Nucleic acid binder design. Structure first.
Ligand code: ATP
Ligand code: ATP
Ligand code: ATP
Ligand code: MG
Ligand code: MG
Ligand code: MG
Ligand code: MG
Ligand code: MG
Ligand code: MG
Ligand code: MG
Ligand code: MG
Ligand code: MG
Ligand code: MG
Ligand code: MG
Ligand code: MG
Lengths: 320, 321, 321, 321, 320, 321
DNA sequence: TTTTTTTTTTTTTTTTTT
């Protein structure tokens, strides 16, 4: 819902412009934002903030709804194909839009490759598992490679010029810039239809920007704010949020029950903010193992997928 | 419960009840538990009218002393919602107790949301099998509600999927203020139809981000205290079980090395004191999960092993052992 | 890049830029990439001054969104440094990529230092033959730097040995703190002259002994992450290719016998994720060496054979086959 | 080198220098190379005092970037110790290089100890005949030191046997901790008189038995890395050749058939990467021995034949061919 | 020096008793023992172990020393005659005390006979190449024969009763028992002057106690510990350690340049641990050939010696 | 010897002694001689239990040092078994020594089996005439055992033929594994009755065919080493003479022509070092045989002439000269 | 009230044949 519909009941265009300058670009943005956030924006009075909230609640349903209606709505929710039938079956149709999907794993585990595949598939038509929308790739490690997008578009029949023109790239150099890029992301989606957000990787910049136990609380608070903004973006625009996470080896030997000594970065903030968490492990050569660690609906299962020159695909017989 | 419309006596008009409903008070119990200052804050109500309403609620809703034997007799017939697992029901002494706030805190994929879905389904099954015979009211703050789980658990328990879904009221809270405001609508709907369960998954998720830093910590704790005061008022009014999930944080300080678990529930003292029962959830092998009673006025501190399956929360299978 | 001497606008004085240079930020890209908190930690910089410095840096250096087509066009003209071996260049898709950290990990005598010397010589040859047309910057931690190799490779590639030696900046790191501090001097040198290569041979040699024990490991990896972040910042600012060598560790856990290679690179996940491209080096027969692309965002996992010669890294001859 | 007494400036008292010497740092280079946290571990030294010491050491000892031509002309005048055999000197490009750790690994009776004795004698002969004009420092861990060999080699080279013996500092290490602690006394002696050679025969012999099993393997290799770092620091400070002998173990896993040698040096990757130059020793016919340059940053992988004689290590004779 | 001298600076008799129960019977043993070895003894704390180390360093010189002083000390060192002038000339005066001498060779090559001769000669006066100390014979093959000692004592004029009473015999039945015997050896040497340790043979028990490729690493680790303990005993008491090693016929015929197809057991551990290694071969009749394979100071040379009823001696003219 | 039942002290029950009995350990001496690792691998035995068993065995069986005078006195009382020939007894210094492994290697039909039969008969005759007064245990592997020889020799020595026959324990080995397993039954039998001789004719006949090729040579010799170790354990435990026969192999390699005898026994160094005494057997004129002491710790290398007769092994007569 | 982290590290022979 466009934010311009709020220009009613004494709400002027200046108020909408000020809200847009503060990172709120849709009616859902005003509806989800708390009253204190509106008050923190300069030039907004308490009464006019209250009337903005009332108008947003009238435009965007904030009340209760039967679970049957929510199930029917989620049945129409778009799922983005990952390019692998095994992975789509594991995810119950692919990457779910409107929810944060976390891909945590060690290096060469295909997280960036899967993100590139998702970035290409977000543009293919809906009938083949696409999203029919532009991608928005947030890169924090410098590991984005448009050659991969060109190859995957060749696999999926997309025009390489059209495929590259429909992928939004911004390189994040620090945690503050990474969070600030979400305002530009919201502004871009308020003008054109997007279908996917990728932040590869979320925790790369937070690792170095905040160092030591003294800044750990600030680091996790900033990460919580960042995924709060990501979840709000997913709610407003219905876009799939795919985030990659680095891992660290658990140096404590007390929990020897766990055969995997590596855990994702971000701690409980990352753990609880992500709707779906996928653990990636190395297979034999191109083989990669994906394990659903956390998911409200998907059972904890493991599937095998492979990385090829044309993107993420199902393992081949010769590779078995 | 006693409907608020019964207060229209001794000169109390319909407009007063309308204003009370607009102020979030939908039952006579709500008026009885509401302090006089809260009634005075409502426009159109004078001091004499406020005290008259208080006296009417007092003579309609008992507020005096009762013998411990009478309270024990009343609690004996209190409904306990089955959790779908015999081990968990034994740990809780019959399941989730209605009329009290039950807190489920633990690490991720520990089954808090799955247990909440199982409780949402079982609140509709007949009382003879540990049900509640009432609608569920699910408040989701993390966007993790999945009606497919409700359908699967209803198939497990024999409930019709359409009936199960139509009897579960779902609302997603996007901020702390909206999370608190949803309770007024919850009370309004409960004043019209019988409910049997309140779920807030999760309470702390929106507060961790809406209030940031030490400066806003006091405001966050005050808002959380208000939210749990409203939840406790709802539980007292409607006798509905309140199940709340809580995320965890890793305690950086290593001073309390005597505790093998470096994870503690979020919310601090307000969270600890507001919850009648707190259950700590840990991951076992495979689908198995460990539930531990951390705080309870009557349940001893003990641990039980339960598992999460496609049909919902249940006891671990022999093949999983 | 954008020189830092363009920041004296909108009330920003030259003295503020002087403190910025003293803090290790020598380019407008450097202050653009540095977070607000890092600017605030510099003495003599206020909140408003740091904010306006950030705004000016963002105006000068594009930090906003850009279409992937533009990024592909920009990367098409990106300079790739030839390694002196056609097989290795084909494996790397043109050679060592500038602006990204390339990691060469392997056991001893596998040619990591030899390949770094070859890259240090080839970074000065003209662009038409795979060069960089820029001075090299060699950071050595094991004391294994040998200018005789540079002279031999320069005679191989036609460079004047005196000019080749004069165009290589060498500094030996004696401790991890000194190794990190050397990057400030590297940035200062690059802010006044064009540099086309960074070599850190080796990154983890000094952290291995500076930090000892499991308890000291966290500080070691935090310092390593800071060092790699600084290297990535240098590569982003100056478009300079960063080539880092890493030693190996034998994996004592024999349960995971599925992997035939018992040697893994040092640094753990910090070095693993910080490096854009990782190349695994193994010894062949005699001069032959095997290079394997363990990790790369765009290069497929493939293995090639290259040899170490008196004149540097080159393709194996049929006589050695 | 720069004596540590030059640090008595800018408020640094004699007590600070005494504590530094007691902590094992006996030169200004030792203070410069040591990290800040290493200085913090010394009692009686504050953080500000450590920063001042680091600044003064960096002012006295150059630590910044230097052009490769300057480093090349500095290494041109570097002293190489003759091994008594022209074949071995040609293989090593002039002899054993000072300021770098040279490793002599091989099977028994292959001449490692004999070559170390020859180097110990030649380090005292004048420079023009390939000497070092400095005292030797022999650290023996197997009890195989034999002054009779030194006397014979001195008679071969014309040195006075009494003078040759008086110029060799002998210390036997009985445990790994004592082996590491001997380096502090070595540095203390070196800061007082000009030395030109350090011999540790052998480095790993004490580590074989001091640490047993895979449980202590990590601690064993960490201690070995600390010992080798300390040796590298000593070489950097005093500009002396560090010659270390290493035992070998026959590799059981014969999976790789490309290596005709079933014996590999002990110490793993720690010793493989710590040693600047590695020489593999094998027995030839009679007194003849085979030396192979396994690892070297500047020397090609080649083999030469040398022999062990009663007067020391020398080239094989025509009668022995 | 006796370990009782460590009872200073607050070190009690209980500490010395615990050290003696742990196999450390001399202050030299405490000095040579590492920090972790001292920490493994119950009843000894961090500060207590450190204080013991400083006291031992004060008593036992552990610092540097000029090579001239060590040369003088080795010049005044005692060398045990082997009863054969040729063998003594080959060894440069006889078996060197304080160093491990390894006698490896085929069967009936004279290793056990030479050990018996050394056991007898360790008691004869110094002026005739003796040691004036008791022998310590550790037998692992059951090949010890006191009749040989009696005959050699008759050759050298010693009283057979005195000769037998001055030889400490203990038969090792397993590798663990063989290693444990060294603690009793140290205890006996701490109270009486010994001059020779014989282990015949070192590798006989290790061959069968550890079997298969999997147990080879543990076998060689235990062997390294045993040889380290032998070297510690030699350093502490200044006694000659004469050990016999059996031989195995190497099957790799590619290295045909070596005319000898038999190599000693123990591999590199025995190769490096032994200060001096002597290869024994049979000559004409009673004559035997001894070859110095490894020695830090003796040239690689061969001499011919013979075995007679009265012990090891030079070959006779009648046997030539 | 000390029976294993005496270990039933300090918490050692019947179960432990039994589990030892099926583990091949039937005496306290067997427990003492067995290493700790061998005790640990036995099922039902804990580390503390194994340590307690070791301490109890050490208390019962003296494992400490002892003066050579005491050893000589004990060996003076050691039993020697007469071979029926004065020449052979004089060559062996009284006959076959008990408690030691005596090897009889020679050409076919040189009397090894006949001498073993004679020893089997003489081990039962009274001690005053060189006997052993104990049962014999014959392990025949070539199938050449003939009880008629035992009957004839018993007639020669005056023993009752039935008493001689039923006092000889026979067990025929069909493969190497069965040959090794038979020693456990031998120990079990000897723990029940007094034995005085063990005969294995022949040791390496079965190993020659069971293991073939270079690959199985290592396993063959390792199994042979285990077998002879067990034989030595039996000899130490029961004080019995172990007499083993071995075939011969002609040395095809004629380069070592210095040895007039081209035949050497099978088993190589394992049999060479495991056998306490080795006797070389050659065929003389007629029925006379030549016996030569090849290896013996105390017997000088000498030869004697003995002959084989119907009544057994005896000295040659004048008519045979 | 708060709020995670983060890898190490080799080893070690063997064993006759006809
Ligand atoms: N063009 C390609 N063709 C085939 N396989 C490729 C190609 N590019 C990359 N790969 C594969 O993908 C791997 C790289 O994985 P990816 O780029 O997804 O990183 P990641 O696992 O997320 O790790 P990081 O933490 O380092 O970013 C390579 O090692 C290779 O196996
Ligand atoms: N349909 C299903 N069938 C079986 N198991 C499931 C299913 N859906 C989820 N699970 C299991 O439950 C886990 C998710 O638990 P749940 O959704 O209750 O989260 P939670 O512990 O409350 O955490 P969060 O804080 O992320 O909401 C999954 O990881 C999986 O193990
Ligand atoms: N009393 C003796 N008189 C003369 N010579 C003897 C005497 N005892 C033994 N010999 C000689 O010594 C040889 C035995 O050698 P020795 O006992 O030293 O064995 P070894 O070579 O160490 O072998 P191993 O321990 O492997 O059996 C006999 O073969 C013989 O030549
Ligand atoms: Mg990636
Ligand atoms: Mg979740
Ligand atoms: Mg949840
Ligand atoms: Mg190198
Ligand atoms: Mg990568
Ligand atoms: Mg040596
Ligand atoms: Mg090297
Ligand atoms: Mg012998
Ligand atoms: Mg040696
Ligand atoms: Mg026959
Ligand atoms: Mg026979
Ligand atoms: Mg023998």
């Amino acid at each position: 819902v466009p934010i311009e519909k709020l220009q009613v009941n004494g709400i002027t265009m200046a108020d909408v412009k000020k809200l847009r300058e503060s990172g709120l670009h849709t009616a859902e943005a005003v509806a989800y934002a708390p009253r204190k956030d509106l008050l923190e924006i300069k030039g907004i009075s308490e009464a006019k903030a209250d009337k903005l909230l009332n108008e947003a609640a009238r435009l965007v349903p904030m009340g209760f709804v039967t679970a049957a209606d929510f199930h029917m709505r989620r049945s129409e929710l778009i799922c983005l194909t990952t390019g692998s039938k095994n992975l789509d079956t594991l995810l119950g149709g692919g990457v779910e839009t409107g929810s944060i999907t976390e891909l945590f794993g060690e290096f060469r585990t295909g997280k960036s490759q899967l993100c590139h595949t998702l970035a290409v598939t977000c543009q293919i038509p809906l009938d083949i598992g696409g999203g029919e929308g532009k991608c928005l790739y947030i890169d924090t490690e410098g590991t984005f490679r448009p050659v991969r997008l060109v190859s995957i578009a060749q696999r999926f029949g997309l025009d390489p010029d059209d495929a590259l023109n429909n992928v939004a790239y911004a390189r994040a150099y620090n945690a503050d810039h990474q969070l600030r890029l979400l305002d530009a992301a919201a502004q871009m989606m308020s003008e054109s239809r997007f279908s996917l957000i990728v932040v590869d990787s979320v925790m790369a910049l937070y690792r170095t920007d905040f160092s030591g136990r003294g800044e750990l609380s600030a680091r996790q608070m900033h990460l919580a704010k960042f995924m709060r903004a990501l979840q709000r973006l997913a709610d407003q625009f219905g876009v799939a949020v795919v985030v990659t996470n680095q891992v660290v080896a658990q140096v404590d030997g007390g929990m020897a029950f766990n055969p995997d000594p590596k855990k994702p970065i971000g701690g409980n903030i990352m753990a609880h903010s992500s709707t779906t968490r996928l653990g990636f492990k190395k297979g034999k050569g191109c083989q990669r193992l994906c394990k659903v660690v956390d998911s409200p609906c998907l059972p904890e299962a493991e599937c095998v997928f492979a990385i090829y020159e044309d993107g993420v695909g199902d393992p081949r017989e010769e590779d078995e």
